[PDB]
């Protein structure tokens, strides 16, 4: 992490990434001109009865708009647990100041 300096925030973000890595499954399909307005990172519930899917959570990853009113989509599977935060402990006592690089007085 380049832009994160808070230890607990970085730990939470790493936990989120680890949770998000467990859902690696993408889906692509096309929809008619209706449903216009879909944008990436939008919540979509997929329901395909042939599979064991009933309102499965997905996030838009790729959206392509054509001039003949057809929208191509690529969904990315997510979960609810991705956005809940697990309890952590305090690293307050593990700080290591650099008190070196100077001459100690007598």
């Amino acid at each position: 992490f380049a832009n994160i300096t808070n230890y607990y925030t970085a730990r939470s973000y790493a936990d989120r990434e680890l949770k998000k890595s467990r859902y690696s499954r993408t889906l692509s399909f096309s929809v008619p001109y209706k449903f216009i307005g879909i944008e990436p990172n939008d919540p979509i519930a997929f329901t395909y009865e042939r599979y064991g899917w009933k309102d499965k959570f997905f996030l838009v990853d790729e959206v392509e708009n054509t001039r003949d009113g057809k929208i191509n989509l690529v969904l990315q599977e997510y979960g609810e647990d991705v956005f809940i935060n697990s309890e952590q402990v305090d690293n307050s006592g593990n700080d290591i100041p650099d008190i070196s690089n100077n001459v100690l007085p007598p």
Binding site: P32, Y33, D68, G69, K70
Partner: protein
Amino acid sequence: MRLPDPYTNPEYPGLGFESVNLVDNDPMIRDELPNGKVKEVKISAQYWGINISYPELFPDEYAFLDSRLLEYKRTGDYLDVLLPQYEAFRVRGDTKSVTIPAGQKGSQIILNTNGTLTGQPKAGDLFKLSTHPKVYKITNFSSSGNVWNISLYPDLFITTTGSEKPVFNGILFRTKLMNGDSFGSTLNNNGTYSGISLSLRESL
């Protein structure tokens, strides 16, 4: 410029249209969803396609027809094509005292005949405005007094400015000759020209 037909030129009976083909060209994007609902999308314009076939042509008939076609290709004019089957005279009178309210951009013309026109147009006839060259077919007609409600197949290619005048008789297709890139006619040993076909397209 008018295409030679046995109306203006009866001395060349071989110039008659042995068979015409009025082609309805309205390109659309048709998509069939798996739920059984077929959906269409229309963007491009509709243009009447006319295909003319000819019989064996004697040297004088072919000379006249070829001179006219070469004059067309020289001046870059527009061939006018007259279909006899669409020349039934129903509406008669003056089309200058009739008024068309402006702002009509849909697929329907509402005009006040002002009682100056006798007869009524029939569905399936040919209708055209005086300020635009596009040719329309009347799909429905309801008359309530002097105001007429004419319904046209192609959506109005122009927005009425209030100065347009309806034209019911003497309607010509402002066509442009296709397949003119490779245009030819074989002359047989018996002196008659064969294999002449005109694929025309309405270039409004």
